[PDB]
């Protein structure tokens, strides 16, 4: 009975710390035992303990198993992934034999497998090619992905990752795609995105985005019954704000101005105002004037405290059309 036998694996484990010695010949004994053995459940166990006693035996076997793996059940496969990791930082020179397998592992397909599989890879490597490989895995994954909690997690890794400050162009670019998925909301997730998103842009991959933003914007209009997305908007604007600072920006911007006119809540006005300030600093000017016109319309077109307030500053500001 495999139940009984398996139970010994724990038990032994218990010995190995308490009185390992009690039995001393074990690591091999096990290892030969493995040979006798064939119940995956027990095997899985067998590995777990075996590496803890000694990796070497597992490795020898590993050599053996290399082709066979693919055929097999995951759980046992997992355990090796941990082991391999610790040793290289201490010392390497080992690769090929592994590689041969590893490539096979670049099938990868269980959500667990995949989850690890890209994760291990990065651990191992970070070549631009590597960067890409893993990246893909994620992106799809995400896309497939549903539990948000999960989603966040990978980000976090990702968040780490960025310190791959060799930071390739592309990758930043793939985001949008991913981002599209956001339209199936969950602000909180979205929000995490926005921050994340902002970062990559050296005031570039920008337009395509911007455009997209505008798309968002339309999308944002829609018919909406904002409750979560509203928040996003504010954030977005922040995210957005930053860029601009850096950038030279464009018509897109005009549109906010318009957009803003539509709207009816203070926080935005505050932003706007924020903009008031800023712009007051920024002055290359030209735009402003149009906008001032735009505004003139907006203004004519409108009433409110907010506005009322608006007038005041603007009034304060003043220039031509004497």
């Amino acid at each position: 009975h495999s139940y009984v036998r398996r139970n010994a694996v724990l038990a032994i484990y218990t010995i190995y710390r308490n009185f390992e010695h009690l039995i001393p010949d074990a690591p091999e004994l096990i290892h030969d035992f493995l040979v006798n053995e064939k119940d995956a459940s027990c095997k899985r166990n067998a590995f777990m303990m075996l590496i803890h006693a000694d990796q070497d035996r597992a490795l020898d076997y590993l050599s053996t198993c290399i082709d066979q793996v693919q055929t097999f059940g995951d759980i046992l496969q997992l355990v090796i992934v941990e082991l391999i990791y610790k040793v290289c930082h201490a010392n390497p020179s080992e690769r090929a034999r592994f590689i041969r397998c590893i490539y096979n592992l670049l099938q990868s397909s269980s959500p667990a497998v995949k989850y690890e599989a890209a994760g291990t890879l990065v651990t191992l490597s970070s070549a631009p090619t590597a960067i890409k490989a893993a990246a893909q895995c994620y992106i799809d994954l995400i896309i497939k992905e549903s539990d948000n909690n999960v989603k966040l997690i990978v980000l976090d890794r990702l968040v780490e990752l960025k310190e791959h400050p060799a930071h390739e162009r592309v990758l930043q670019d793939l985001v949008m795609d991913i981002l599209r998925v956001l339209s199936t909301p969950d602000l909180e997730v979205r929000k995490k995105t926005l921050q994340l998103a902002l970062d990559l842009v050296s005031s570039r991959n920008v337009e395509e985005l911007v455009i997209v933003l505008k798309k968002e914007v339309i999308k944002t209009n829609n018919v909406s019954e904002h409750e979560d997305t509203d928040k996003y908007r504010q954030l977005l604007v922040r995210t957005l704000h930053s860029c601009s600072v850096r950038f030279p920006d464009m018509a897109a911007n005009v549109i906010p101005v318009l957009m803003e006119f539509l709207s009816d809540s203070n926080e935005a006005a505050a932003a706007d105002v924020l903009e008031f300030v800023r712009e007051a600093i920024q002055r290359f000017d030209n735009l402003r004037m149009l906008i001032v016109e735009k505004m003139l319309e907006v203004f004519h077109a409108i009433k409110s405290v907010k506005i009322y307030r608006g007038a005041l500053w603007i009034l304060g500001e003043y220039c031509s059309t004497k």
Partner: protein, 427 residues
């Protein structure tokens, strides 16, 4: 393990039941956890929170929470299944839901944790079946009836007695993307690298457990002009080394003539590609074959073992350079004290080794010795490792000349000969 505890929870600020896989501490780990859980941290919703790298994994199921905890990464779904799974199991296990029922079937419930999960491993399926394993069995019964009965017979009888008495590659390439004379500039159009490697294991006693020698002549020709040539091989070797010629090479020619040439003389050797025209192998137990014997004699003076090690060159032919004899040392004891020595030494505190280097070992100077002292046991000193490089081959085999197949004119050639150590160890 993948979980040091599973605690099943009720809303109360308190977790309805729990089990501690491993004891050490007190509840304060668990107790503290309980407190935090009860508090919830006012936090609104969300079925997961991990904070500070600790997963606090939960599931509200009602007014109840079932909770698991972990700190380092996991594959989610599996997990979920479990929380949920718990949420499938209980009305079966302990009966429905209300603490009490469970209070009565505590034992059952805890038993279920273990049963279900053996240290963070999803053990099975099928609850009823799960019942089955213990306190529900089969074997024991089978045995009992027969046995009990048998005994019973003996007993009955006794009663009377008593009574009366491609793809991979794509990636791979992308990713992939002492010195010998390296450039083609410093080599003749005909060039041969003769390399030998030695694998040797010896007991401290001096017996030869195993010796393996492998060697080969690699031929490389830079100019087609040289393509049809024959190599003249000189063989002084007494050892009984086995030689094998490349499959393309004329075996008979080599045997009688000791010349290396292609079976078809008209054929040409490859250009700018290495060809292993000849290979040889020697495997032997005979100690006489050991190139350089090492004698290490630890002896323990009172408090403070003294180690004396010597080497002697058996084969007068060899000239060994950069010989390093690496001796392991006990640690925590401090540095070894060096007495009389031939050559020099390097002490590595981190490695805990004493590397003994040189003197050049020639026929003229066959032996040398080293003496040092350190506190330790004789076993601390082994295994001893020997490393060296030799310009001359162990096997007395050399390519004296090269001639053209047609006309048999002599041709200039260069050779690189190396004798390297794969492993040379003294147990």
């Amino acid at each position: 393990m993948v979980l040091l505890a599973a605690a099943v929870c009720t809303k109360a600020g308190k977790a309805i039941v729990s089990r501690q896989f491993v004891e050490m501490t007190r509840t304060r780990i668990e107790g503290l956890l309980a407190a935090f859980p009860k508090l919830m941290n006012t936090g609104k919703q969300h079925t997961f929170v991990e904070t500070e790298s600790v997963r606090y994994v939960y599931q509200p199921m009602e007014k109840l929470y079932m909770v698991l905890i972990t700190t380092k990464n996991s594959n989610i779904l599996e997990d979920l299944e479990t929380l949920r799974l718990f949420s499938r199991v209980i009305p079966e296990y302990c009966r429905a839901l209300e603490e009490n029922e469970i209070s009565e079937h505590c034992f059952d419930l805890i038993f279920a944790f273990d049963e279900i999960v053996a240290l963070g491993y999803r053990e099975n399926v099928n609850l009823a079946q799960i019942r089955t394993f213990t306190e529900m069995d089969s074997h024991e019964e089978k045995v009992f009836r027969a046995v009990r009965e048998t005994q019973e017979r003996e007993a009955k009888a006794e009663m009377r007695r008593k009574a009366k008495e491609k793809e991979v590659d794509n990636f791979v390439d992308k990713l992939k993307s002492t010195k010998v004379h390296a450039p083609p500039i410093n080599m003749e159009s005909v060039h041969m690298k003769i390399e030998e490697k030695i694998t040797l294991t010896c007991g401290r006693d001096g017996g030869l457990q195993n010796m393996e020698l492998h060697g080969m002549i690699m031929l490389r020709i830079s100019d087609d002009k040289f393509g049809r040539i024959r190599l003249h091989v000189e063989n002084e070797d007494k050892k009984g080394v086995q030689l094998q010629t490349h499959p393309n090479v004329d075996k008979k020619l080599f045997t009688a003539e000791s010349l290396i040439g292609l079976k078809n003389p008209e054929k040409s050797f490859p250009v700018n590609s290495d060809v292993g025209v000849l290979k040889w192998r020697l495997q032997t137990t005979e100690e006489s074959f050991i190139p350089l014997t090492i004698n290490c004699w630890p002896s323990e003076s009172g408090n403070g073992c003294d180690v004396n090690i010597e080497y002697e060159l058996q084969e007068d032919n060899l000239e060994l350079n950069d010989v390093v004899i690496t001796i392991p040392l006990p640690s925590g004891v401090g540095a070894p004290v060096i007495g009389e020595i031939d050559g020099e030494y390097r002490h590595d505190s981190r490695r805990n080794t004493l590397e003994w280097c040189l003197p050049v070992i020639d026929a003229k100077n066959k032996s040398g010795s080293l003496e040092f002292s350190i506190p330790g046991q004789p076993n601390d000193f082994f295994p001893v490792q020997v490393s060296f490089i030799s310009k001359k081959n162990y096997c007395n085999i050399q390519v004296t000349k090269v001639t053209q197949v047609d006309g048999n004119s002599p041709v200039r050639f260069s050779t690189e000969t190396t004798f390297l150590v794969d492993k040379y160890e003294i147990l």
